[PDB]
């Protein structure tokens, strides 16, 4: 905890991230072969021979066809959802998940984690630098509610204002600037010690890291990155940020009475490129998401 | 009437290569949900339709064996059975065609 | 206005020299090996001088 | 100028058109599933539905028997129509003769289709199913539906 | 024709006459035949005139190869890199002397359309024409139909 | 490249009647909201001057019919029905050609699912279902 | 007869230095003497020219022409030789670089016109060439906006000189 | 066939011409092409510049340190003892250092006594331009020291070409006095300044700040920019004229497409006029006293 400009903080954070990723890649010495199997439906019995801790499941979908690259959003390594750009470890059996599948609930949760994380990325770089922004967390709300939510403490100077429609449309236009550049959701699975050594300043991030490290016995939390943003989340993400097509932040709401300081919950709604809606239905969904989502218990 | 002059290759390339004569890219195409063999929207998948027509052909061959000659065409419903698969009580009067296979996991 | 193509060919060699001849092909090797040298199982274990 | 002019011109005349549709319809009543070009099965589907209506008028009706005697050219399909097809649709009103496009004929590249009577002891067609309710858009619309249900 | 061939602007190679003049010829490579009537004029040129030519302008290195050839040639190499090969097949002594003298005089630039035969490098002195030359100014720079 | 789409492509089996009922109820309420224009905030009504030109309508030609007068003659009439007519936007005198002011008038109601995005934005700003 | 498109797969480059880019793989394949006219085959070759190989197969599986099955066979076996022989590791990661059609050797017949007159009917044949290059398909050249038009016009006006004088 | 030989041979020579124009070979030094003799080329190099070099010092100047190390590497990969002449090659380092020092100080003296108003930093940038890599390589290439230079990697990378050009300057300084070498670098370097503006060689960044510093030295107060001539402010192709007035007196005037670039060009025009470097200056007096 010290005085730091907001840019040298992201410099030291993504430099430490790149150092840990280089160490993760360098720990394995050679090219080890793993035999990932395809236990899906369409092309059964296919067995790839991959490079261990190098090859992604996107690099397994590239072997088959281009449609496995276009429409597959999450992998399913043996029982567990694996994000499409995470290097495989052991000899496994794999299966790809799409948006128009029969039971897409896991990939819906993954999509809304990724959209809430994008909203945090677009909130944290839009405010005045003399004001302080502390990204608290994104609580895992179910997708049956209309919007994804992200929790942010604003400045002590700003316990009185609320944004008009122009600031919200500025937020969505910056989020569309984020969407228009096709960026990879890069993951990295780090120990709790290195992860706590990354952040070091946001005490809200510190207790969230401790909460996610307390539940597994190895103390490993899931870090992710879009470009130069680094955030904590539970579970996997979607591959690219260009999968989102219709994006919007709806409103903000203040939830005071549980705490002295004021936490502001930013809300917004999204839809992928394969599941886009007509303008009328989209305005209906945009209209519902202004109401406050409260599903935490 | 006859041509008065030979059309050159410049005029011909201007005619036979414009976007009104080129082949239009279509984008109705996606993978089939079962069997992944690249159907078109608004069109049944040719692989799945080939599956169904092969099984229908074998059922029709067994029907043609059971009906003897032509002009027979019974006055009862028919129903097909695979190996195992005892006739249900609701299919009592219905004609029973049993070929020999396991029941495939799309015909239920 | 009465003309056809040419060149009926085939792309696989075959066994014409025994179809009749009096010159046989003069080989300079054999097919495989006579009886395979089975090495000792611990050849890297006894990779020193002797035991 | 063919404003408001139904009934495509199919064969070599009006009578040849009726005979083409009659042969397609007789094949449909016998085999319960047909593939033919798309215009022909469109016309024959429009005829097949009212044939089922005439079969459902009854067996002792002389007009329905005359129509079944004309339109069915094999004369064993008349007991089949009056005792299997018409009792099968005793509850329904008009939803039968399901028609779907199959890709193309091999030689002359025609638009082909498949029609079948419902019921149909044959294996089922690979029908395209409407999208599942657990997807992203439908869960959003289900949230909206539940919200405006509780608001009422 | 001039639309069918390239063209260059009139130029010196390295500003010759400004400081010191330098001979722009480097080499002359002669290939004449011992036997063979086609190289008779060149044979007499090597007999009588190439020694005085070499003494005359000493910047040039001259080589005589004396090779069996049906057509003798002369290769003239210049300072800027260009190589000009000319055939002295069945020529006089006077024609070959004229040819090597003309090769000695010229510089290595291309003989193409030479395009505006003057190369002023600072053409204007009193100041080049712009539409506000020969135009008077008005009080406080007012434009036509102005008010203040 | 992006493929084509329509309104009910990705909708479920249960969501299509709900969306039909929802949008039908919404534009029925929007048509019923504009029913009393004189109580909202009407623009100033003027009396008739002799050099005046007023607005017209957009009707839908149903059919024809005979029609008799008191002398006995028979005339034929065309029945034009005014289905759903609404003034849409007004352009003042200096903004089109400097000659006469213009008024836009819309025809019968059609579906939102089959219009362009800017047209739907225009009717959403105005508050009416889209016109043909 | 000249067959050089077949011999282009036998080029062998020197081994690359470590401080160099990848040099993507290049695979040439062709099918000779197809019984199909070279213009109608050219329309399909122009359809493919820039697309990726899976998109090319998708467009050619649903195009209702005689040459479509032929080019689909050629592209499938070129994909197979690319993965097997020329050491492309991903089957999908190939784009069509060149795609064209040439004249093949034709035959001649009589057509028997309707008097004692005749024509020379010609039995047409053609080729199909294809060249695959591994890598993603290159992005299309975007149409020039008004900024580039204005910049080129101002560059043109800045380029001019006082002609026919010093 | 048609009988004969001459048309077939002529078509053969055309085939070799077309095939050589399709796949051109990588170019080779003139030392490896057939008509070449080194001693005659060094003598003719001395004679065409109208100079009198002592040929040992020129042969010293044309070798290079890389050539020495590469020749000893070639004689050691083959193992042949060439410690006879290679130990006495004496690479051109010291002659190049003498040549660079003399050329720098003599170009500085010429440019100081021609423009006594130009600042020290400007004359430093001008002698950095004339002794810069590009123009000494251009003069070196069109004076044929490139063909005589001993090195590896045939196109003679421009540091080595600059080094050997200043080495032959040093050889001329050794064999003849400072006046002859002064005349040499006059005729072959200062003529490269012809037809170039000042700030095509100095390449300054902020001309207005340098101009107000210059007027701070001359005790003239501060130039105020007043707009003089303009033709179309609303269009996309304007023309402006900004004049810089010092105590209600014009000192320069510069055109441009906006007001800012016209003001910057007016600063450039004043900054040229102060330094005694205008396009109307006395051209360089190439003569002999
Ligand atoms: Mg016909
Ligand atoms: Mg005859
Ligand atoms: Zn399928």
UniProtKB/Swiss-Prot annotation, chain A:
Any one GO biological process: mitochondrial translation
CDD domains named in the record: TGS
Keywords: Acetylation, Leigh syndrome, Mitochondrion, Primary mitochondrial disease, Ribonucleoprotein, Ribosomal protein
Broad class of where this protein is predominantly found: mitochondrion
Compartment list: Mitochondrion
Tissue specificity note: Isoform 1 is ubiquitously expressed. Isoform 2 is heart-specific.
Listed GO CC annotations: mitochondrial inner membrane; mitochondrial large ribosomal subunit; mitochondrial ribosome; mitochondrion
PROSITE patterns, sorted: TGS (PS51880)
Gene3D superfamilies the UniProt entry points to: 3.10.20.30, Threonyl-trna Synthetase, Chain A, domain 2
Subunit structure: Component of the mitochondrial large ribosomal subunit (mt-LSU). Mature mammalian 55S mitochondrial ribosomes consist of a small (28S) and a large (39S) subunit. The 28S small subunit contains a 12S ribosomal RNA (12S mt-rRNA) and 30 different proteins. The 39S large subunit contains a 16S rRNA (16S mt-rRNA), a copy of mitochondrial valine transfer RNA (mt-tRNA(Val)), which plays an integral structural role, and 52 different proteins.
Protein name in the entry: Large ribosomal subunit protein mL39
Gene source species: Homo sapiens
Gene: MRPL39
From Swiss-Prot, chain B:
Keyword Ribosomal protein in annotation: yes
GO BP term, example: translation
PTM field: MRPL32 precursor is processed by the m-AAA protease (composed of AFG3L2 and SPG7), which cleaves the N-terminal transit peptide. Cleavage by the m-AAA protease takes place prior to assembly into the large subunit, an essential step for mitochondrial ribosome (mitoribosome) assembly. Proper processing by the m-AAA protease is dependent on the zinc-binding region within the tightly folded C-terminal domain of MRPL32: zinc-dependent folding halts degradation initiated from the N-terminus and triggers the release of mature MRPL32.
Basic and acidic residues composition bias: residue spans: 91-103
Chief location category: mitochondrion
Organism superkingdom: Eukaryota
Protein family according to the UniProt entry: Belongs to the bacterial ribosomal protein bL32 family.
Biological role stated in the UniProt entry: Component of the mitochondrial large ribosomal subunit (mt-LSU). The mitochondrial ribosome (mitoribosome) is a large ribonucleoprotein complex responsible for the synthesis of proteins inside mitochondria.
Descriptive protein name: Large ribosomal subunit protein bL32m
Annotated gene: MRPL32
Residues of the full protein shown: 79 to 186 of 188
Swiss-Prot record, chain D:
GO biological process terms on file: mitochondrial translation
Keywords of the record: Mitochondrion, Ribonucleoprotein, Ribosomal protein, Transit peptide
Cell compartment(s), UniProt: Mitochondrion
Tissue expression as described in the entry: Detected in adrenal gland, mammary gland and adipose tissue.
GO molecular function: protein domain specific binding; structural constituent of ribosome
Domain of life: Eukaryota
Gene3D superfamilies linked to this entry: Ribosomal protein L17
Lineage of the species this protein comes from: Eukaryota, Metazoa, Chordata, Craniata, Vertebrata
Protein name: Large ribosomal subunit protein bL17m
Alphabetized NCBIfam families for the sequence: L17
The family this protein is said to belong to: Belongs to the bacterial ribosomal protein bL17 family.
Main location: mitochondrion
GO cellular component labels: mitochondrial inner membrane; mitochondrial large ribosomal subunit; mitochondrion
Subunit structure: Component of the mitochondrial large ribosomal subunit (mt-LSU). Mature mammalian 55S mitochondrial ribosomes consist of a small (28S) and a large (39S) subunit. The 28S small subunit contains a 12S ribosomal RNA (12S mt-rRNA) and 30 different proteins. The 39S large subunit contains a 16S rRNA (16S mt-rRNA), a copy of mitochondrial valine transfer RNA (mt-tRNA(Val)), which plays an integral structural role, and 52 different proteins.
Record's keyword annotation contains DNA repair: no
Swiss-Prot record, chain H:
Domain DRBM, chain residue ranges per copy: 206-276
GO biological process: mitochondrial translation; mitochondrial translational elongation; RNA processing
Ranges where the RNase III domain occurs: 56-198
Entry's EC annotation: 3.1.26.-
Domain of life: Eukaryota
Alphabetical list of CDD domains matching this protein: DSRM_MRPL44
Broad class of the protein's primary localization: mitochondrion
PANTHER family in the cross-refs: LARGE RIBOSOMAL SUBUNIT PROTEIN ML44, RIBONUCLEASE III
Protein name: Large ribosomal subunit protein mL44
Provenance organism: Homo sapiens
Name of the coding gene: MRPL44
């Amino acid at each position: 905890a010290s005085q730091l400009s907001p840019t040298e903080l992201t410099e030291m954070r993504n430099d430490l991230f790149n150092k840990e990723k280089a160490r993760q890649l360098s720990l394995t010495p050679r090219t080890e072969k793993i035999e990932v199997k395809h236990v899906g439906k369409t092309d059964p019995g296919t067995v790839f021979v991959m490079n261990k801790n190098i090859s992604t499941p996107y690099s397994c979908a590239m072997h088959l066809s281009e449609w496995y690259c276009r429409k597959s959003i999450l992998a399913l390594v043996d029982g567990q959802p694996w994000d499409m750009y995470k290097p495989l470890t052991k000899s496994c059996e794999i299966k790809f998940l799409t948006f128009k599948d029969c039971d897409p609930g896991e990939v819906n949760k993954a999509y809304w984690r990724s959209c809430a994380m994008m909203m945090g990325c677009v909130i944290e770089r839009a405010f005045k630098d003399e004001y302080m922004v502390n990204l608290v967390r994104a609580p895992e709300v179910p997708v049956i509610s209309g919007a994804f939510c992200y929790d942010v403490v604003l400045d002590s100077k700003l316990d009185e204002w609320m944004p008009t429609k122009e600031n919200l449309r500025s937020f969505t236009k910056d989020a569309h600037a984020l969407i228009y550049k096709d960026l990879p959701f890069e993951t990295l699975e780090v120990e709790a010690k290195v992860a706590l050594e990354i952040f070091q300043h946001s005490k809200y991030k510190v207790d969230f890291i401790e909460e996610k490290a307390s539940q597994n016995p190895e103390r490993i939390v899931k870090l992710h990155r879009i470009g130069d943003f680094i955030d904590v989340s539970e579970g996997p993400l979607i591959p690219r940020t260009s999968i989102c097509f219709q994006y919007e932040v709806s409103a903000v709401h203040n939830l005071q009475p549980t705490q002295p300081s004021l936490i502001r919950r930013f809300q917004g709604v999204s839809l992928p490129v394969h599941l886009r809606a007509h303008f009328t239905i989209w305005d209906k969904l945009l209209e519902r998401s202004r109401k406050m989502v409260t599903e935490d218990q | 009437a006859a041509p008065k002059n030979r059309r050159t290759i410049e005029v011909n390339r201007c005619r036979r290569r414009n976007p009104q004569k080129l082949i239009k890219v279509k984008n109705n195409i996606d993978v089939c949900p079962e069997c992944g063999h690249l159907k078109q929207k608004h069109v049944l998948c040719a692989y799945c339709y080939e599956k169904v027509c092969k099984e229908t052909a074998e059922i029709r061959r067994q029907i043609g064996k059971q009906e003897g000659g032509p002009f027979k065409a019974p006055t009862i419903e028919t129903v097909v059975l695979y190996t195992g698969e005892t006739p249900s009580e609701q299919d009592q009067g219905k004609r029973i065609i049993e070929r020999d296979r396991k029941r495939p996991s799309w015909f239920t | 206005t009465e003309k056809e193509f040419m060149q009926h060919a085939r792309k696989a060699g075959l066994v014409i020299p025994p179809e009749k001849s009096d010159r046989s092909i003069h080989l300079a090797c054999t097919a495989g090996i006579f009886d395979a040298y089975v090495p000792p199982e611990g050849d890297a274990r006894i990779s020193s001088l002797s035991k | 100028i063919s404003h408001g002019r139904v009934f495509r011109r199919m064969g070599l005349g009006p009578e040849s058109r009726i005979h083409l549709l009659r042969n397609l319809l007789t094949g449909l009543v016998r085999h319960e599933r047909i593939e033919a070009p798309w215009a022909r099965v469109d016309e024959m589907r429009g005829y097949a539905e009212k044939l089922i209506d005439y079969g459902k008028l009854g067996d002792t009706n002389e007009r329905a028997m005359r129509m079944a005697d004309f339109w069915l050219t094999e004369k064993d399909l008349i007991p089949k129509l009056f005792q299997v097809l018409a009792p099968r649709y005793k509850d329904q009103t008009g939803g039968y003769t399901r028609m779907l496009q199959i890709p193309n004929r091999s030689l002359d590249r025609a638009k082909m289709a498949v029609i079948e009577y419902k019921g149909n002891c044959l294996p089922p067609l690979p029908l395209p199913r409407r999208d599942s309710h657990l997807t992203l858009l439908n869960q959003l619309l289900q949230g909206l539906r539940q919200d405006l249900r509780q608001s009422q | 024709t001039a639309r069918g061939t390239p063209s260059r602007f009139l130029a010196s190679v390295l500003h010759n006459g400004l400081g010191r003049y330098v001979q722009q010829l480097q080499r002359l490579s002669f290939s004449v035949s011992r036997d063979g009537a086609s190289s008779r004029g060149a044979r007499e040129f090597v007999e009588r005139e190439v020694i005085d030519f070499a003494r005359r302008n000493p910047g040039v290195v001259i080589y005589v190869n004396s090779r069996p050839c049906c057509v003798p040639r002369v290769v003239a190499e210049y300072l800027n890199g260009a190589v000009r090969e000319e055939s002295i097949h069945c020529k006089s002594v006077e024609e070959i002397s004229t040819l090597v003298q003309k090769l000695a005089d010229q510089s290595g630039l291309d003989v193409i359309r030479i395009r505006k035969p003057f190369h002023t490098d600072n053409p204007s002195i009193q100041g080049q024409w712009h539409p506000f030359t020969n135009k008077p100014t008005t009080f406080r720079g007012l434009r036509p139909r102005e008010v203040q | 490249g992006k493929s084509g789409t329509w309104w009910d492509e990705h909708l479920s089996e249960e969501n299509v009647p709900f969306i039909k009922q929802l949008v039908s109820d919404e534009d029925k309420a929007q048509l019923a909201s504009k029913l009393c224009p004189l109580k909202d905030e009407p623009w100033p009504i003027h009396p008739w001057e002799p050099g005046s030109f007023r607005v017209g309508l957009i009707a839908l030609k149903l059919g024809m019919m005979p029609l008799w007068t008191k002398d006995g003659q028979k005339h034929v009439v065309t029945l034009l029905q005014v289905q759903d007519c609404h003034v849409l936007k007004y352009t003042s005198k200096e903004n089109c050609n400097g000659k006469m002011a213009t008024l836009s008038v819309g025809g019968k109601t059609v579906s939102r699912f089959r219009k362009a995005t800017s047209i739907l934005e225009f009717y959403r700003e105005l508050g009416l279902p889209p016109k043909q | 007869i000249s067959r050089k498109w077949e011999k282009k797969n036998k080029i062998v480059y020197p081994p690359q230095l470590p401080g160099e880019p990848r040099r993507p793989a290049e695979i040439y394949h062709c099918r000779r003497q197809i019984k199909y006219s070279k213009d109608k085959m050219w329309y399909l070759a122009k359809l493919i020219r820039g697309m990726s190989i899976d998109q090319a197969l998708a467009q050619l599986e649903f195009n209702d022409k005689k040459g479509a099955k032929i080019i689909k066979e050629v592209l499938l076996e070129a994909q197979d030789m690319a993965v097997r022989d020329h050491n492309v590791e991903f089957r999908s990661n190939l784009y069509i670089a060149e795609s064209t059609s040439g004249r093949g050797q034709c035959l001649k017949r009589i057509r028997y016109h309707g008097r004692g007159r005749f024509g020379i009917m010609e039995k047409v044949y053609c080729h199909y060439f294809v060249k695959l290059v591994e890598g993603p398909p290159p992005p299309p050249e975007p149409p020039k906006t008004a900024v580039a038009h204005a910049k080129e016009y101002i560059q043109q006006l800045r380029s001019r000189t006082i002609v026919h004088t010093l | 066939v048609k009988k004969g030989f001459r048309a077939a041979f002529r078509f053969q020579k055309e085939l070799e011409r077309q095939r050589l124009l399709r796949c051109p070979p990588p170019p080779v030094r003139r030392s490896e092409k057939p008509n070449w003799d080194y001693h005659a080329e060094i003598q003719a190099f001395g004679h065409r510049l109208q100079e009198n070099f002592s040929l040992d010092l020129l042969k010293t100047a044309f070798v290079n340190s890389c050539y020495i190390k590469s020749e000893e590497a070639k004689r050691q990969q083959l193992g042949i003892e060439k410690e006879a002449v290679l130990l006495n090659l004496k690479s051109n380092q010291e002659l190049s250092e003498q040549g660079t020092s003399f050329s720098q100080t003599c170009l500085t003296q010429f440019l100081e006594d021609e423009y006594p108003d130009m600042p020290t930093e400007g004359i430093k940038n001008l002698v950095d331009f004339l002794t810069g890599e590009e123009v000494v390589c251009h003069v070196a290439r069109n004076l044929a020291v490139e063909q005589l230079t001993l090195s590896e990697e045939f196109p003679v990378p421009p540091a080595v070409l600059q080094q050997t050009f200043f080495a032959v300057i040093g050889a001329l300084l050794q064999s003849s006095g400072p006046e002859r070498t002064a005349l040499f670098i006059r005729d072959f370097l200062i003529t490269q300044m012809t037809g170039k503006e000042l700030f095509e060689m100095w390449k300054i960044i902020n001309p207005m700040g340098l101009l107000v510093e210059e007027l701070k030295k001359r005790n003239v107060s501060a130039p105020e920019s007043r707009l003089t001539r303009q033709s179309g402010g609303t269009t996309a192709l304007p023309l402006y004229f900004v004049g810089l007035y010092c105590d209600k007196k014009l000192i320069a005037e510069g055109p441009g497409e906006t007001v800012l670039v016209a003001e910057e060009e007016a600063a450039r025009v004043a900054l040229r006029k102060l330094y005694g470097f205008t396009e109307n200056r006395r051209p360089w007096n190439y003569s002999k006293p």
